[PDB]
Amino acid sequence: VGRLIYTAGGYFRQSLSYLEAYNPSDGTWLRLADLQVPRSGLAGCVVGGLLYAVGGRNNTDSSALDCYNPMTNQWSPCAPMSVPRNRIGVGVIDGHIYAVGGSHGCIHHNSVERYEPERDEWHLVAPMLTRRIGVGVAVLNRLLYAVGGFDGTNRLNSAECYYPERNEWRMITAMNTIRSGAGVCVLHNCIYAAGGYDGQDQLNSVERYDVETETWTFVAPMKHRRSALGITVHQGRIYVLGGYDGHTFLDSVECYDPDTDTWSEVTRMTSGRSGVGVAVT
């Protein structure tokens, strides 16, 4: 009935078609219409109550944008991006979807494009300073942040900031830890970077960046270490969904209370998966 946490796609042995929704009010899961094409490594977002699945890898790298309407339980195709973008990052500014980075085969994108729902059109914006796949994306104060990822040579702890009015990117303070495939979100005016892969291990560490003091501080780590996790914010708490811990595909969903600096496991997906697109509406 209320706002749900949607997880689309993912990987477990193969790319998946599942669209499921979690109700944090009563702990229930709903099963919704499958995606047209199974996809992992995509990103989710919500604009005008519509859920969007962006990019990923098919079953093969995907330029697709698909739109799910919760009121009709239907997926519809949208204008494709100018390039396939697997392991994409996505952020929304003023009802516009920014597709950041990602990979096409062995090409590691630094390009960025902007989708206009009112026109069903994508347009390129200024490219990032760094090529980033597995990049975490966060929107804060009408700025778009691109955090960590892999540039094709090094895994990254750097982060950079896009200025829509200036159409430009600037590097910001780097993270304490290198992170590709982290969950990045915004909670209570800070950017959170949860988990990821530092080049040797999946991580359970979690650091937040305070823009005022422009520094990254560690906070309480998660129970299960994980990369390629889904992440979202619901009612002032962070939810991370699934992922890969180095051996298993997680079905675990942990929830972070910023006021207690605590991670509790609050439910479990119907099956373990990583590389899901996650959004709330």
Ligand X SMILES: COc1ccc(S(=O)(=O)N(CC(N)=O)c2ccc(N(CC(N)=O)S(=O)(=O)c3ccc(NC(=O)CCN4CCOCC4)cc3)c3ccccc23)cc1
Residue-wise DSSP of 47-61: ETTEEEEE--B---B
Identify which of residues 24 and 184 has a Cβ nearer to ligand X in the complex: 184
Strands (DSSP E) contained in 117-247 are 121-125, 136-140, 143-147, 159-163, 168-172, 183-187, 190-194, 206-210, 215-219, 230-234, 237-241
Task: Using alpha carbons only, give the angle 197, 200, 203 rounded to the nearest 5 degrees.
Answer: 40
Shortest CB 13 distance to ligand X, Å:
4
Dist. CA 200–CA 265, nearest whole Å: 25
Residue 230 CA: distances (Å) to CA of 87, 91, 255? 12, 14, 12
Shortest CB 37 distance to ligand X, Å:
13
Identify which of residues 46 and 137 has a Cβ nearer to ligand X in the complex: 137
Identify which of residues 157 and 180 has a Cβ nearer to ligand X in the complex: 180
Dist. CA 273–CA 246, nearest whole Å: 13
Identify which of residues 23 and 176 has a Cβ nearer to ligand X in the complex: 176
Shortest CB 146 distance to ligand X, Å:
13
Q: Are 234 and 258 in contact (CB under 8 A)?
A: no
Dist. CA 147–CA 279, nearest whole Å: 18
Identify which of residues 28 and 154 has a Cβ nearer to ligand X in the complex: 154
Identify which of residues 122 and 150 has a Cβ nearer to ligand X in the complex: 150
Identify which of residues 75 and 150 has a Cβ nearer to ligand X in the complex: 150
Shortest CB 211 distance to ligand X, Å:
25
- For residue 212, which of 229, 243, 183, 189 has the smallest C-alpha distance? 189
Residues of the shown chain interacting with ligand X in the complex, contacts defined by CB under 6 A: 11, 13, 40-41, 57, 86-87, 133-134, 150, 180-181, 197, 227-228, 244, 246, 274-275
| Pairing mode of beta strands 121-125, 50-54 | unpaired
Nearest residue (beta carbon) to ligand X: 181
Return the structure tokens found at 22. 């979690």
Identify which of residues 41 and 70 has a Cβ nearer to ligand X in the complex: 41
Shortest CB 135 distance to ligand X, Å:
8
Shortest CB 215 distance to ligand X, Å:
24
Q: Are 216 and 209 in contact (CB under 8 A)?
A: yes
Computed from CA positions of residues 232, 141, 212, 228, in that sequence, does the dihedral angle turn out positive or negative? positive
Shortest CB 97 distance to ligand X, Å:
18
Q: Are 138 and 92 in contact (CB under 8 A)?
A: no
Shortest CB 110 distance to ligand X, Å:
15
The DSSP letter of residue 132 is -
